[PDB]
Write a protein that holds these residues in place. Sequence first.
Motif, mmCIF file in Angstrom:
data_model
loop_
_atom_site.group_PDB
_atom_site.id
_atom_site.type_symbol
_atom_site.label_atom_id
_atom_site.label_comp_id
_atom_site.label_asym_id
_atom_site.label_seq_id
_atom_site.Cartn_x
_atom_site.Cartn_y
_atom_site.Cartn_z
ATOM 1 N N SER D 1 4.738 5.482 7.054
ATOM 2 C CA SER D 1 3.648 4.958 6.223
ATOM 3 C C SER D 1 3.012 3.708 6.835
ATOM 4 N N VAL D 2 1.717 3.498 6.597
ATOM 5 C CA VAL D 2 1.011 2.255 6.950
ATOM 6 C C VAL D 2 0.455 1.608 5.689
ATOM 7 N N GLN D 3 0.780 0.340 5.451
ATOM 8 C CA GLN D 3 0.164 -0.468 4.401
ATOM 9 C C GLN D 3 -0.461 -1.723 5.009
ATOM 10 N N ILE D 4 -1.760 -1.913 4.804
ATOM 11 C CA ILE D 4 -2.460 -3.134 5.192
ATOM 12 C C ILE D 4 -2.961 -3.803 3.924
ATOM 13 N N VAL D 5 -2.572 -5.054 3.710
ATOM 14 C CA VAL D 5 -3.068 -5.872 2.605
ATOM 15 C C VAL D 5 -3.894 -7.000 3.201
ATOM 16 N N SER E 1 7.984 2.672 9.259
ATOM 17 C CA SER E 1 6.738 2.279 8.595
ATOM 18 C C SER E 1 6.197 0.930 9.083
ATOM 19 N N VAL E 2 4.894 0.708 8.903
ATOM 20 C CA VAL E 2 4.204 -0.540 9.262
ATOM 21 C C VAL E 2 3.626 -1.202 8.021
ATOM 22 N N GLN E 3 3.946 -2.474 7.800
ATOM 23 C CA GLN E 3 3.324 -3.290 6.764
ATOM 24 C C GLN E 3 2.673 -4.526 7.389
#
Lengths: 75, 75, 75, 75, 75, 75
Positions: D1-5, E1-3
Amino acid sequence: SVQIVYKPVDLSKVTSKCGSLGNIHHKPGGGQVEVKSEKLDFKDRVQSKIGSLDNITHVPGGGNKKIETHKLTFR
Amino acid sequence: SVQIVYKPVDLSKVTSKCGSLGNIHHKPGGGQVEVKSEKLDFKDRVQSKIGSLDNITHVPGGGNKKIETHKLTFR
Amino acid sequence: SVQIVYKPVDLSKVTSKCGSLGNIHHKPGGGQVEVKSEKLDFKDRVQSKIGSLDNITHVPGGGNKKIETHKLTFR
Amino acid sequence: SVQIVYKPVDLSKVTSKCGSLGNIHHKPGGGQVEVKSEKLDFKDRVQSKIGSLDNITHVPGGGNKKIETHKLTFR
Amino acid sequence: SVQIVYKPVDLSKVTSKCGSLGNIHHKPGGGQVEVKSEKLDFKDRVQSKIGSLDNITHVPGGGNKKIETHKLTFR
Amino acid sequence: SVQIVYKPVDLSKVTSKCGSLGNIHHKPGGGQVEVKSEKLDFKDRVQSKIGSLDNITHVPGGGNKKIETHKLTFR
């Protein structure tokens, strides 16, 4: 002849800035609060506040008051 | 002849800045709070505050007061 | 002949800056707090505060007061 | 998964106070001014100001400018 | 995963106080000014100011400028 | 897994105080000024100021400048 000129002048500026003004609270976090009470006996008034985060501003003050008395007595 | 000129002038500036002004609170964190009370006996008034993070500003002060008396008496 | 000119001038500036002003609190952290009370007997008033992080500003002061009396008496 | 905030925050305070602020001028007096001109020859533009007392405030400045660029590029 | 969490914060304070601030001028007195001009020849622009008392505040400055660039690039 | 946290904080205070601030001028007196001009020949621009008392404040400066660049590049 008698001439009396009675012309006092009030051009004053009065300002009160009282309480919480212009503050920044960035992400303040209250922690978990647990209150456990067993077999307590209260024989007079109870005032209780339970919270996590309180921001309280109480301003009884900051009032501006002017009392001015003018008397001109002739003879 | 008699000439009386009574012209006092108030051009004053009065400012009060009282309480919490222009502060920055960046991520203040209250810790966990646990209160455990058992078998307590209170015979008079109880005032209790339980919290984690408190910001309290109380300002009874910061009032501005002016008392001015003017008397001109002739004869 | 008699001439009286009564023209006092108040051009003063008065400022009060009282309490918490312009502070920076960066990530202040309150610790964990545990209060354990058993078998306490209170015969008179109780005032209790339990917290982790407190920021308290109390300002009864910082008021500005001016008393000015002007009297001109002729004969 | 990728999450960018992407949540930059601007809580800055910017103030400009430019020109003449909070000054007191108590009884400033301009003197007598006499200008006598005879047989003057002007072959281009004339700008002339004649006065006794001048109070001049000119503020081309005191502007507040913010430029902010935000770019979020994904793949 | 990437955050990726991109949350820069600007909590800065910027103030400019530019020009004439909080000065007191008590009874400033311009003297008599006499200008006598005879047989003057002007072949180009004339800018002339004649006065007794000048108070001049000129503020091209005191501006606040912020340039901020934010770039987040993923792959 | 990869976690990147990009949270630079600007809590800076910047102040400029430029020009004439908090001065007292008590009874400054400009002298008498006499300007006598005869048979002058001007071939180009003339800028002329004649006065007795000048108070001049010129502030091209006192500006506050912030340039900030933020770059986060992933892969």
